[PDB]
Design a protein around this ligand. Structure first.
Ligand SMILES: [Mg+2]
Ligand SMILES: [Zn+2]
Ligand SMILES: [Zn+2]
Lengths: 156, 1358, 49, 99, 73, 50
RNA sequence: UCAGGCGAUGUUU
DNA sequence: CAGCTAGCCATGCACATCGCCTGGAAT
DNA sequence: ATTCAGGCATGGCTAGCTG
């Protein structure tokens, strides 16, 4: 279902985001709630209500990120061994019809469309844990099977 | 009149001494001639007459015959009261087993006989037999028996042999039993015991026995022979409208018992067959059981319709017995209630009241002043006048109210503000008028609430109400030092709009000689209410030796602001009112005012602020208009792009690059980002939207949009609410908790299609249900707390000690959360404080700490302070003054007597409703996990090593080769401020003595692997390494490279089952490499199930990581809940998987393996070695063998057990633990609470203790007793030439330390009754008053306030 | 109920928290007057004596 | 609503409850906590002795009020006396003691 | 003519013995004679006593003194 | 005739009553206009069109 | 004047 | 003969108010 | 006109199974 495999750059980025949330964001909403509490009503008030909701939502995020940071297996592996396509690799694939794609394969937490946005648990990657340049590889989409071909690989 | 109550059991002699008569017949009354039945449950010749001094026979009817009984019916003449005291009894033919002594769990009888409760039941319900005096026969004494066995035995030994069945048998048993020989033999056995559970049972039994002997009682009395009946009145027989009577319960029950008894009595004449009389006795036993406690045997007997009729047990138990219904809170005369309204023309030490309510209240006073001024002879004409409501009465009422304070109360009284005082001022209408500036302390809006009045009667009472509860004398909540007279919600908008600035309005650019002519301009209407102006103002300052001095100048300010200036009293600076004046501003305004100019100025200043605020707010007129909530012109396009993005992601899904939850999270994240963009957009489009000309071109400024003012002031609502009025209202969870996957792209200004409103309904309803249940638990918590700290009163002045605790500013490794000044303010010094000019004392050792001393501390970078706590006072029965610090809500030190327990309890309880209920508290590892792999220094200073054993690799970094090292933080002085462990093979970015700053990451590693660091460089061979035999070559897909995994003894082959895999450094050729300098070989030997990554032909460095130790660690801290976390912390529950610790300092080793679990052993340096303990080896081990540590140190991880913490580290340690924990649980939700109160609760938590050695004392060894008693004992013991006593303090949960108290009525009014009353009864436990709740019960004074003077005089009496 | 002319603005405190204010122009025309009816009962028992 | 001196219940000589029955308010447990919180004591005393329970108490109180002399005389409550009787109903022996 | 008791608290630093002292003086003024020692202002004995306290010429000491002086008889 | 409290509106997020107020204002506007047109008694055709 | 049922009004995520 | 150990009971569950209604079946 | 069938959390305890 999951894989603790994560890349070190994203690891650092995530830790920094954690520190950001826990230092310079929590206390401001904290002050707002401490303020709003001094008002009289609580069931006839909504400011306390929605500010508390904000706290709950940020708490859930910090909980998730905490458990992650606990269970993150890091592999900051170099281009030392190369020749197949196993992890942390740039990959070009093309269709037999003209469709092309470029992407890097990373772990679950690194998918937000910016640079390297594909998770290993996806069938695409699952059909590519190790291949050779110039080979067919098929996947099983909900609309049937597909096909592409490799073009090039550069680790880093 | 009396003193300490006493309680014990009852003898038949005692009862027959009690009663005056005897019951025979079950009838109640005639229903025909409502004279009562003869010689039954209402009989004068037993109980007493009905009409005063008139016999039922109708012969004597006047006091002339007072005191003589009748002769035709024989009834004593006496006041009708007596039917509230006399009592009656009943003759039971058979004996009867009382039930409290039978099913209290434990069973008193049960362990008295050392007999199973099941069989004892079997006996008391006639389905067995039991032997008495078996004699020289085949059988035993306690030997229970069955039907056919009894039959056979009687067939064979119908002789002197005797066994019986039924209550008579229990009675014969007990009466036969002795106690002296029992105690002797049991003490013998306890000397001869070796099994702890056996010891536990036997010690409970021996305690009960020896107590039963010391007290003057006889066991057989636990079996009723004569049952007493409750007096008549207390079971009244009320007549209803109609020829019927409201049936009670006790009547029915007694009647049932008496019927059954009379039947059995009749049966013992015909000598009927015995099965019949057995069924009879069984009925009677069950009936008496019903009368004493209906509902503790099987299915409870019902009454009229469907429900268990109420019995005496219920008379006392429950939320509706006598205690919590008629002795702790009584209804009260002289009162009334009504609805509230506002009336802002009042000075805050007076409140409205309606004429009709008054004229109904003070009727006595009116009567009195009437017959004083001589307007009516007797009381009759007086009452007639005050009903007819003629003229003079109203003048009289004005004269009698003038200065006679009253009390106002609101329903859910939480904290001691919940009752304040006022002076009346008569109003028309019919609804109490109440000042505005208190509707925050009452937590009372004007939506139709109700308030109650109360009128003190006596004179001491008036003076109490004026000198302690009058409203002026409460400007600070005792919870925490912030003010409570905070102006609330309109007045703030007022002052706001009154002080601000535009860029260009009328009258700009002129000069004014004084605030006077300023106001004059603004009234005449030739100058705007706000426009920046240079004016002259004069201010005062008391910089001299408490002396005021003036100075004047030309400030630059705003006209309105000048107008505000005419209200500030003499002594403030000017900058306090030269800004926006939001809510925080005005709050600290009042605060500084109170800190600098006493009290009267502050009161009068508060009143003037409220007036002028309302005035200028009205003159302002800040409405709200639908065209004043501007939707930004970009909402449309942003939602458009969001939809485009989710379309792209859906295309990628059906193209096959993502999974289900993958799409889920992707979508939800991009919507959240869009939400934030929209929020920022609207906030910028409002807050500063106003752009205008200046007499030049343009310049923007803060806006005049009504809603933004009503928010930025601090009146009501904020960024969140203006969001939900302008931007999209985010996402909405569903009952499952699974957040829904389509946001609500609408907002309250535009419309809503159905589904969206529907989902929002989901949310709201769940919210309401949680409100209800959470309220419940909060109330229960408050109650429990106040019933444990109730008995603590500041009783002396100076304990005169030298202990204390250490306070340091709380820092999370990085930022400081709460500063030392705030954690120290008010609490009083323990020792002296030498300046960091060491050997130079700054402040004396026994001084108070006010704000000037605070600043003096700040100006010298004070590290930590040793301060006097409460938890370590040295007082008998009390808590000394200095050790308690500033009583918040007052300036100076606490007074000699003000109870603190109760206010502490209420404060820790009140905010409780704000906590959540079901979340996961993770305030305890946010920084832990964030700093596992990287050591975090806290403060500035150089880096110091302790027992270094390290080397700098060829990479240019210093790595350590042993655990012996420790980290210290050198200061600019030469001491040690911070200390840290040293992970094996750590990474040192800095060095030793290298002066650095604070808060810098200088280390890194994998917190899941111990390195296999080398000593020097070299090459690696496969020394003592065989695949299959020793290791395995597992392929690693997701890394490309694979590794070598160690195969343990349990899995590997047998021929190399013991071969230890090794690694010897070599050169390029492979020559013999020793340890550098020494002749000893240099191969490292590998542990089991490790991961070697490197292979043959590899170069390494001086301390390079060769292999890796797979290190598992579970941080399952999911136990944390929140409010139940508070519950459990005051409960002292043992957590689920407790972390074990170090008993005593010494070295460690292992022992037997897999006795289901593994073992552990520890040997001291020179002490008793054999200590061991079973560990489930599946738990992680943070320990190695060759590691020698100190007592109380940690060995495993997880929660930290309060019990062990107490018994091993120190009382200071345990109290610091609890305070940090509970403080964090609160402060995460943001509610300030000074720590004193949590401290005092903890104190009451640890009030008991246990013994170790008898010494010369007068106690049993394995005995429990209160600390204070034994301390005062052994103190006077050591006073003379004897040996002291040895003891150990032990921590108990509140729901226990309540019960296990010297007093008992305290408990009996708390959470259960049967347990306490029974234990006390068998104990024969005398009980002095000595507390609060007792004296509230019995109604005399309280040893808390004025009562303190009174009780000291009383104690001096003797 | 009835429909009345209304205006949103603080006015000298009297509407401090939620306290509606009402002008005599209302209590004159009797446009909130209500009618209530209670019902009282006396009985005639026949008790001995 | 308001009450000065009206009826009295029959079992426990306390004032009644509600309005239709011409009774008075209720002085709740948490309010007793509050008054203990302040140092006020005499107020609490006559709040749950002179105005509620002692029959002789309030008769004396009334007769003294009508003539200026503001002064109570506590005596013993009565609901407590009832508690004594109902515990004594059982096999227990509870008592007061020497003066 | 009284709003706060601060000056009284000052002149007797207890804030409790204040109550008893005031009550005692008040009973003296209400039950039996012994006219007050300050120009009254149509005000009740309670306020009268607090006022004569803050004037600073009454406390427990003087009370016992004058009681003894009466009992001299 | 009645003067509520403005600060009550943003707190209790019920923006509705403000719209209700406006629309009512429009209503009574049409009303008073008709009342004038009728009191200054006119030909019915004007009322028809209006 | 007692006990229960029912409903309703307040404080109360 | 001892250390759990799972399964079965006891006891606990905020405060204040107002209105209405109904109080044994067989002989 | 007399008479006899929707809870939870917790703690305490008792048979009952492994060494
Ligand atoms: Mg309300
Ligand atoms: Zn007679
Ligand atoms: Zn002390």
């Amino acid at each position: 279902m999951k894989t603790p495999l994560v890349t070190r750059e994203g690891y650092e980025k995530l830790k920094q985001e954690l520190n950001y949330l826990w230092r310079e964001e929590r206390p401001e909403v904290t002050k707002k709630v401490t303020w709003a509490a001094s008002l009289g009503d609580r069931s006839e008030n909504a400011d306390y209500q929605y500010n508390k909701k904000r706290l709950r939502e940020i708490d859930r995020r910090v909980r998730y990120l905490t458990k992650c940071m606990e269970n993150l297996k890091i592999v900051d592996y170099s281009p030392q061994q190369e020749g197949k396509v196993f992890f942390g690799a740039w990959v070009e694939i093309e269709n037999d019809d003209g469709v092309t794609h470029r992407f890097r394969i990373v772990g679950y937490d690194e998918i937000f469309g910016r640079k390297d946005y594909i998770s290993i648990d996806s069938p695409m990657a699952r059909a590519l844990l190790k291949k050779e340049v110039g080979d067919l590889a098929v996947v099983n989409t909900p609309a049937g099977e597909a096909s592409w071909y490799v073009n090039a690989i550069e680790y880093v | 009149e009396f003193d300490a109550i006493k309680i014990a059991l009852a003898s038949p002699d005692m009862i027959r001494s009690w009663s005056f008569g005897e019951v025979k017949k079950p009838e109640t009354i005639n229903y025909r001639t409502f004279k009562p039945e003869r010689d039954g449950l209402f009989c004068a010749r037993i109980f007493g007459p009905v009409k005063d001094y008139e016999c039922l026979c109708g012969k004597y009817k006047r006091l002339k015959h007072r005191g003589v009984i009748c002769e035709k019916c024989g009834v004593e003449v006496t006041q009708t009261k007596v039917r509230r005291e006399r009592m009656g009894h009943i003759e039971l033919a058979s004996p009867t087993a009382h039930i409290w002594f039978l099913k209290s769990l434990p069973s008193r009888i049960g362990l008295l006989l050392d007999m199973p409760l099941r069989d004892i039941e079997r006996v008391l319900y006639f389905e067995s037999y039991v032997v008495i005096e078996g004699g020289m026969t085949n059988l035993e004494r306690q030997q229970i028996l069955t039907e056919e066995q009894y039959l056979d035995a009687l067939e064979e030994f119908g002789d002197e042999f005797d066994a019986k069945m039924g209550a008579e048998a229990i009675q014969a048993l007990l009466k036969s039993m002795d106690l002296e020989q029992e105690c002797e033999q049991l003490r013998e056995e306890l000397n001869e015991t070796n099994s702890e559970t056996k010891r536990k049972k036997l010690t409970k039994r021996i305690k009960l026995l020896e107590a039963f002997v010391q007290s003057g009682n006889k066991p057989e009395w636990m079996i009723l022979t004569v049952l007493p009946v409750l007096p008549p009145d207390l079971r009244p027989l009320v007549p209803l409208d109609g020829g019927r009577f409201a049936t009670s319960d006790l009547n029915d029950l007694y009647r049932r018992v008496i019927n059954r008894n009379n039947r059995l009595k009749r049966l013992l004449d015909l000598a009927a067959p015995d099965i019949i009389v057995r069924n009879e006795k069984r009925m009677l036993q069950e009936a008496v059981d019903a009368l004493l406690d209906n509902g503790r045997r099987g299915r409870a007997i019902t009454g009229s319709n469907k429900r268990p009729l109420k019995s005496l047990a219920d008379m006392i138990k429950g939320k509706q017995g006598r205690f919590r219904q008629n002795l702790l809170g009584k209804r009260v005369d002289y009162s009334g209630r009504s609805v509230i309204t506002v009336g802002p023309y009042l000075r805050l030490h007076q409140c409205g009241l309606p004429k009709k309510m008054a004229l109904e209240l003070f009727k006595p006073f009116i009567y009195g002043k009437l017959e004083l001024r001589g307007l009516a002879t007797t009381i009759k004409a007086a009452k007639k006048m005050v009903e007819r409501e003629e003229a003079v009465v109203w003048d009289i009422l004005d004269e009698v109210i003038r200065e006679h304070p009253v009390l106002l109360n609101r329903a859910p009284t939480l904290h001691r503000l919940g009752i304040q005082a006022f002076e009346p001022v008569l109003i028309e209408g019919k609804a109490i008028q109440l000042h505005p500036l208190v509707c925050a302390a009452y937590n009372a809006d004007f939506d139709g609430d109700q308030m109650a009045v109360h009128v003190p009667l006596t004179l001491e009472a008036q003076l109490e109400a004026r000198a302690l509860m009058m409203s002026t004398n409460n400007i600070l909540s005792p919870a925490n030092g912030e003010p409570i007279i905070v102006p609330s919600q309109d007045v703030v908008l007022g002052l706001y709009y009154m002080t601000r600035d535009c860029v260009n309005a009328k009258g700009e650019g002129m000069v004014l000689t004084g605030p006077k002519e300023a106001e004059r301009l603004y009234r005449s209407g030739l100058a705007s209410l706000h426009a920046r102006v240079k004016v002259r103002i004069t201010e005062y300052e008391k910089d001299a030796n408490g002396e005021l001095v003036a100075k004047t100048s030309l400030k630059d300010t705003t006209v309105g602001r000048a107008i505000l200036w005419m209200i500030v009293p003499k002594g403030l600076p000017y900058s306090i009112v030269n800004q926006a004046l939001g809510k925080k501003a005005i709050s600290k305004m009042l605060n500084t005012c109170y800190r600098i100019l006493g009290l009267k100025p502050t009161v009068i200043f508060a009143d003037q602020i409220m007036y002028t605020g309302f005035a200028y707010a009205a003159r302002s007129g800040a409405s709200v208009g639908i065209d004043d909530m501007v939707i930004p012109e970009k909402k449309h396009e942003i939602i458009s792009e969001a939809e485009a993005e989710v379309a792209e992601i859906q295309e990628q899904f059906q193209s096959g690059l993502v999974t289900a939850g993958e799409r889920y999270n992707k979508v939800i994240d991009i919507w959240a980002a869009a939400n934030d963009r929209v929020s920022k957009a609207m906030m910028d489009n409002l807050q500063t939207e106003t752009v205008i000309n200046r007499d030049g071109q343009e310049e923007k400024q803060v806006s005049f949009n009504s809603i933004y003012m009503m928010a930025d002031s601090g009146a009501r609502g904020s960024a969140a609410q203006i969001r939900q009025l302008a931007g999209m209202r985010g996402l909405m969870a569903k009952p499952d908790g699974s957040i829904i996957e389509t946001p609500i792209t609408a907002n309250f200004r535009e419309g809503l299609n159905v589904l969206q409103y529907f989902i929002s309904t989901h949310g709201a309803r769940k919210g309401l249900a949680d409100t209800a249940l959470k309220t419940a638990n909060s109330g229960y918590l408050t109650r429990r707390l106040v019933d444990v700290a109730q008995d603590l009163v500041v009783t002396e002045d100076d304990c005169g000690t030298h202990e204390g605790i250490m306070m340091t500013p709380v820092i999370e490794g990085g930022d400081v959360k709460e500063p030392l000044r705030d954690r120290v303010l008010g609490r009083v010094t323990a020792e002296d404080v030498l300046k960091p000019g060491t050997a130079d004392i700054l402040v004396p050792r026994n001084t108070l700490l006010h704000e000037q001393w605070c600043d003096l501390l700040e100006e010298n970078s004070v590290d930590a302070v040793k301060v006097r706590s409460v938890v370590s006072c040295d007082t008998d029965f009390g808590v000394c003054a200095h050790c308690y610090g500033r009583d918040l809500a007052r300036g100076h030190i606490i007074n000699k007597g003000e109870a603190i327990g109760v206010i502490a309890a209420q404060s820790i309880g009140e905010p409780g409703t704000q906590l959540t209920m079901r979340t996961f508290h993770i305030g305890g590892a946010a920084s832990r996990a964030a700093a596992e792999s990287s050591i975090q220094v806290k403060n500035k200073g150089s880096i110091k090593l302790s027992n270094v054993k390290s080397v700098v690799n060829s990479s240019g970094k210093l790595v350590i080769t042993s655990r012996n090292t420790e980290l210290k933080l050198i200061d600019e002085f030469g001491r040690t401020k911070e200390s840290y462990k040293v992970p094996y093979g750590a990474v040192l970015a800095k060095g030793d003595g290298e002066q650095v700053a604070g808060g810098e990451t200088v280390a890194n590693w994998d917190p899941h692997t111990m390195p296999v660091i080398t000593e020097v460089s070299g090459f690696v061979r496969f020394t003592d390494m065989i695949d299959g035999q020793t290791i395995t070559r597992q392929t690693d897909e997701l890394t490309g490279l694979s590794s070598l995994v160690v195969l343990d003894s349990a899995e590997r082959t047998a021929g190399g089952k013991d071969l230890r895999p090794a690694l010897k450094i070599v050169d390029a050729q492979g020559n013999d490499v020793l340890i550098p300098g020494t002749d000893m070989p240099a191969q490292y030997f590998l542990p089991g199930k490790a991961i070697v990554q490197l292979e043959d032909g590899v170069q390494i460095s001086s301390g390079d990581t060769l292999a890796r130790i797979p290190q598992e660690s579970g941080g399952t801290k999911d136990i944390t809940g929140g409010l139940p976390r508070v519950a459990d912390l005051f409960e002292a529950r043992r957590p689920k998987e407790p972390a074990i610790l170090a008993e005593i300092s010494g070295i460690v080793s292992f022992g037997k393996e897999t006795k289901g679990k593994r073992r552990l052993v520890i040997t001291p340096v020179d002490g008793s070695d054999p200590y061991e303990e079973m560990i489930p080896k599946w738990r992680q081990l943070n320990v190695f063998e060759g590691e020698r540590v100190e007592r109380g140190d940690v060995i495993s991880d997880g929660p930290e057990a309060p019990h062990d913490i107490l018994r091993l580290r120190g009382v200071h340690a345990v109290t610091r633990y609890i305070v940090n924990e509970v403080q964090d649980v609160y402060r995460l939700q943001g509610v300030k609470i000074n720590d004193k109160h949590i401290e005092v609760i903890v104190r009451q938590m640890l009030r008991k203790a246990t013994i170790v050695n008898a010494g010369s004392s007068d106690f049993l060894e394995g005995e429990q007793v209160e600390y204070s008693r034994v301390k005062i004992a052994n103190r006077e013991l050591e006073a003379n030439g004897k040996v002291g006593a040895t003891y150990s303090r032990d921590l108990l949960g509140i729901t226990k330390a309540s019960l296990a108290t010297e007093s008992f009525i305290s408990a009996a009014s708390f959470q259960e009754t049967t347990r306490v009353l029974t234990e006390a009864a068998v104990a024969g436990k005398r009980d002095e008053l000595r507390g609060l709740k007792e004296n509230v019960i019995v109604g005399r004074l309280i040893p808390a306030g004025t009562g303190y003077a009174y009780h000291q005089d009383r104690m001096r009496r003797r | 109920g009835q429909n009345m002319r209304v205006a949103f603005m603080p006015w000298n405190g009297y509407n401090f928290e939620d306290s509606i204010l009402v002008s005599e122009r209302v209590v004159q025309e009797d446009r909130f007057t209500t009618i209530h009816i209670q019902e009282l009962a006396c009985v005639s028992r026949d008790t001995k004596l | 609503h308001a009450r000065s001196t009206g009826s009295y219940s029959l079992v426990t000589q306390q004032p009644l409850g509600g309005k239709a029955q011409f009774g008075g308010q209720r002085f709740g447990e948490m309010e007793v906590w509050a008054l203990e919180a302040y140092g006020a004591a005499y107020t609490l005393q006559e709040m749950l002795t002179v105005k509620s329970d002692d029959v002789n108490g309030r008769t004396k109180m009334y007769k003294n009020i009508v003539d200026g002399n503001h002064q109570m005389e506590p005596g013993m409550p009565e609901s407590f006396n009832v508690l004594l009787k109902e515990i004594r109903s059982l096999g227990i022996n509870i008592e007061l003691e020497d003066e | 003519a009284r709003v706060t008791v601060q000056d009284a608290v000052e002149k007797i630093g207890n804030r409790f013995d204040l109550v008893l002292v005031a009550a005692r003086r008040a009973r003296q003024m209400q039950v039996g004679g012994k006219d007050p020692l300050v120009p009254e202002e149509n005000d009740k004995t309670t306020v009268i006593a607090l006022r004569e306290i803050e004037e600073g010429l009454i406390n427990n000491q003087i009370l016992d003194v004058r009681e003894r002086q009466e009992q001299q008889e | 005739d009645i003067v509520l409290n403005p600060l009550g509106v943003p707190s209790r997020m019920n923006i509705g009553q403000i719209l209700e107020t406006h629309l009512g204002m429009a209503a009574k506007g049409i009303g008073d206009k008709i009342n004038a047109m009728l009191k200054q008694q006119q030909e019915v055709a004007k009322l028809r069109e209006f």
